[PDB]
Structure 1
Amino acid sequence: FLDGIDKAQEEHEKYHSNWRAMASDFNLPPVVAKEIVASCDKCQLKGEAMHGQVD
């Protein structure tokens, strides 16, 4: 569980975009791969949340 995530966790590269590849590389069910996406803010949120303010 946590140990698999530590080795799987790395820089936000192309592997982060395709979480399915990581699950196959470690042969783990999408459950562990999805958690990494949830922890990585870049992989979780796509566009910006609020528009901020109008200048």
Structure 2
Amino acid sequence: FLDGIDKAQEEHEKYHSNWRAMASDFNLPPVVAKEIVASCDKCQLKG
């Protein structure tokens, strides 16, 4: 849970836009990937 996020956590690069690639890379359900998107304000709030 928290460990997977620490590694998955990273700069707001293009991988953030494609959360699926991150779930596929770590083979985790959209839940963990979605939570990271929700924590990143840039990915969550649009403008």
> Pairwise CA RMSD of aligned residues?
0.3
Identify unmatched segments of 5+ residues in structure 1: 47-55
Q: Which has the higher contact order (CA 8 A, sep 6+)?
A: 2
TM-score (norm 1): 0.82
| 1:10-39: CA deviation from partner (whole Å, max 9, x where unpaired) | 000000000010000000000000000000
Structure of greater Rg:
1
TM-score (norm 2): 0.96
- How many residue pairs are counted as aligned between the two chains? 46
SS of alignment partner, residue 32 of structure 2 = helix
Identify unmatched segments of 5+ residues in structure 2: none
Give % identity: 100
Q: Could you list the structure 1 runs, at least 4 aligned residues long, displaced by more than 2 angstroms after superposition.
A: none
